[PDB]
Design a protein around this ligand. Structure first.
Ligand SMILES: NC(=O)c1ccc[n+]([C@@H]2O[C@H](COP(=O)([O-])OP(=O)(O)OC[C@H]3O[C@@H](n4cnc5c(N)ncnc54)[C@H](O)[C@@H]3O)[C@@H](O)[C@H]2O)c1
Ligand SMILES: NC(=O)c1ccc[n+]([C@@H]2O[C@H](COP(=O)([O-])OP(=O)(O)OC[C@H]3O[C@@H](n4cnc5c(N)ncnc54)[C@H](O)[C@@H]3O)[C@@H](O)[C@H]2O)c1
Ligand SMILES: O=C([O-])CC(=O)C(=O)O
Ligand SMILES: O=C([O-])CC(=O)C(=O)O
Lengths: 327, 327
């Protein structure tokens, strides 16, 4: 059938090296769906060269679903008629880079990329921001694309979700495949809040199996929250492969549906749970018909609104600092 | 169903970083087949640490097919009850390493690993050697495992096959998915011989479409033959991702079958095409019922036996140098 055009940023980087071959393999949009990859890297020769080699490798796999693949240096061309956009490329916080130097640098990447998507991408393109700071970058891009619907601008909280999903199965000794209703609120940061209060394994309450809140506050939350750094402790390098799986999961679920299951998505707030509007935020959502839907009525206890507080604040902080680039 | 136990070597390395997540995802043995990964790395702390991080990442993907995963430092334990073994780890030819220093180093890895598979693996384990020199390493291992059937010891020629598969679709402008009957003879080296004389696209003769033998001898063969190095020219690093796909393809096809299609496998010679017995060699094969079968009757013209000559000789050379380790 009609192949979709998938534009992916930072194509020559680590996440993409794991991400690109599974997209081409059909992991992200189904096995009966051909794809046209439109890759974007910075215009530097060493980046583009590397981007050339990666393309040579993708071909060397003989993927029957790959109906096309082009390399770009301009977002304006890489975003042309894109149905989906994975914004993985972002400016790393180098030596001397204060939090403010990061937000300012990345803001300028995302207003530009956001205006290009706004201009040439599909009128209902699904955007997903992986490059950090994910949530604030998805917001910038979203604000920079007034012709596109805000809800199409999401941020990946699915890595934190799959990591909380991993910790629980480990603790419960239960298959990770059977964990129902787990989710994550807020920012994709250690400040995130993995909420296990509603999760169930075989209908049984996960919270009640563990039957230990000290584990929750002291072990589950900090482990998930700092898992990324633990990967760097072991591997010496970031978590490319798992982040790339999360993005596959995010788009796959968003597009193909969760059939009732709850999942996590950094989406623009509609004011639910008291979260200010237009704030890209981790929310438990169910997907269907190509769209998400926030899970409502969840009881937010003292411990939770407190954690939801710290994560929203950090986000509000980041929004404040990138406002001046959104003139 | 009954999960198979997949032992994979060099787990903390590059090929594996791309390989492991697709095995767990079910790309290699089917989506209804759970797997138990049994990972092996050298006993060094930095290797094992890295191997720990990779395992943390595999969990962070919440793969429903992954019924288990353990890290090892001993082949004797990593090979326990293994149904399939991907021998990806091998000693790199470092500075000052003459061809002889390589074969001697790698020989000593494969006799040891070959005796351990021989001892604790399944009585009909499928072995596949990715670590270079692939063919000669698969031979060493095979010879070191007299209790197991020789035919179970293969070497990956599927990367050269998928690269020849890529070059042809590129030249013909035809989908790589439609190229029938292409194959590769000999050693996994630039000395390999991609044979397009029998390939067909929609029943049509590929050779006759190109209608240019100078392209064959001067462009197709050298490009495929030196594609690996071209990847290092562009990327700055080896071809991890595509090699990892090839291994998925090799095992997948070997196990699930090619349904009539021809593919390439470095297998122990039975004397077909005049190739000496027990010589791991690229041969066009069709798979079924869990086993391969050499394509017979292919006409071997002057140009071909000549190329088949250079590749067998190189292999015979490598065999000669590793004999003294096979006491
Ligand atoms: N979302 C998550 O859960 C999560 C998890 C881990 C890491 N990360 C983030 O993912 C991003 C990428 O990390 P990586 O390890 O893959 O990085 P990497 O350095 O290997 O790749 C980043 C790539 O993006 C490119 N790039 C830079 N500016 C670009 C631009 N203006 N336009 C197009 N491409 C651009 C770079 O040249 C680079 O190759 C980072 O911001 C990283 O911190 C996010
Ligand atoms: N078969 C092919 O078509 C093909 C293609 C490209 C590269 N290669 C080869 O693949 C092999 C691996 O390459 P890579 O880029 O993934 O390498 P890498 O260096 O990233 O990984 C090799 C890993 O194997 C481990 N190892 C070493 N000795 C081992 C042993 N004795 N037991 C268990 N593990 C051991 C190392 O610690 C290392 O982490 C190399 O020999 C390479 O040249 C083969
Ligand atoms: O996911 C990562 O690599 C980093 C991250 O957000 C964490 O540990 O909070
Ligand atoms: O596959 C590789 O990376 C190297 C190789 O065999 C080649 O170019 O011959």
């Amino acid at each position: 059938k009609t192949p979709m055009r998938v534009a992916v940023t930072g194509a020559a980087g680590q996440i993409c090296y794991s991400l690109l071959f599974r997209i081409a393999n059909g992991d992200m949009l189904g096995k009966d769906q051909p794809v046209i990859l439109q890759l974007l890297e910075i215009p530097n020769e060493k980046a583009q060269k590397a981007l050339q080699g990666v393309m040579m490798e993708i071909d060397d796999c003989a993927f029957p679903l790959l109906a096309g693949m082009t390399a770009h240096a301009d977002p304006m061309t890489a975003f042309k008629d894109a149905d989906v956009a994975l914004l993985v490329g972002a400016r790393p916080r180098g030596p001397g880079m204060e939090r403010k130097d990061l937000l300012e640098a990345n803001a300028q990447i995302f207003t530009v990329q956001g205006k290009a998507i706004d201009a040439v991408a599909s009128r209902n393109i699904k955007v997903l921001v992986v490059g950090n700071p994910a949530n604030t970058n998805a917001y910038i891009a979203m604000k920079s694309a007034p012709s596109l619907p805000a809800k199409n601008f999401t941020a990946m909280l699915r890595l934190d979700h799959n990591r909380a999903l991993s910790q629980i199965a480990a603790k419960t000794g239960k298959p990770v495949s059977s964990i129902e209703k787990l989710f994550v609120w807020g920012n994709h940061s250690p400040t995130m809040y993995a909420d296990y209060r509603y999760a169930q394994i075989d209908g049984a309450s996960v919270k009640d199996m563990i039957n230990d809140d000290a584990w929750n506050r002291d072990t589950f939350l900090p482990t998930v929250g700092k898992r990324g750094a633990a990967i760097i402790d072991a591997r010496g390098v970031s978590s490319a492969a798992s982040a790339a799986n999360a993005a596959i999961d995010h788009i796959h679920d968003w597009v193909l549906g969760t059939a009732g299951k709850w999942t996590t998505m950094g989406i623009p707030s509609d004011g639910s749970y008291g979260i200010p509007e237009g704030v890209i935020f981790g929310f438990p959502v169910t997907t269907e018909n190509g769209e998400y839907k926030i899970v409502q009525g969840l009881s937010i206890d003292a411990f939770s609104q407190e954690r939801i507080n710290v994560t929203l604040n950090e986000l509000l902080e980041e929004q404040n600092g990138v406002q001046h680039l959104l003139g």
